[PDB]
Symmetry: C2
Subunit: 79 residues, 2 copies
Amino acid sequence: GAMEQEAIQRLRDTEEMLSKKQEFLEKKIEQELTAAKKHGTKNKRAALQALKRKKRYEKQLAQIDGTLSTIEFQREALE
Amino acid sequence: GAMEQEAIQRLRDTEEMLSKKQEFLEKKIEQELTAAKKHGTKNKRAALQALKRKKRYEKQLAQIDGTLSTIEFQREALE
């Protein structure tokens, strides 16, 4: 009943925020890989930092994927 | 940023929920060990049932503890 559903809802709210953060990391990747191509020749400094940031978002995005799989598994166990 | 802070708060709310279930399961396990020592070799059927309950709580607890670390580390990664 109510208390059980609440616990599942906490997990759902977390999933939904992490999924939102994924989507935003994907838009950022795309901005960064676009900027690195844009600056490749005329601004090597900006390009190189774009690529470091892209890699950092890629890593953050991986941690988030693993957190989601963990959340889903915990939530199934409670359902 | 704002998105990270919202995600970080929903992670905190999940940790709080998880710690409450953790404390419930830990108590239940303590209670089963205490009862197993008192009851001893009095009744095989009841002992087997109790060993089954204790194993279920231990399995649920191991899951909860794994989820909690994962959520904690994800939160720290967004800060």
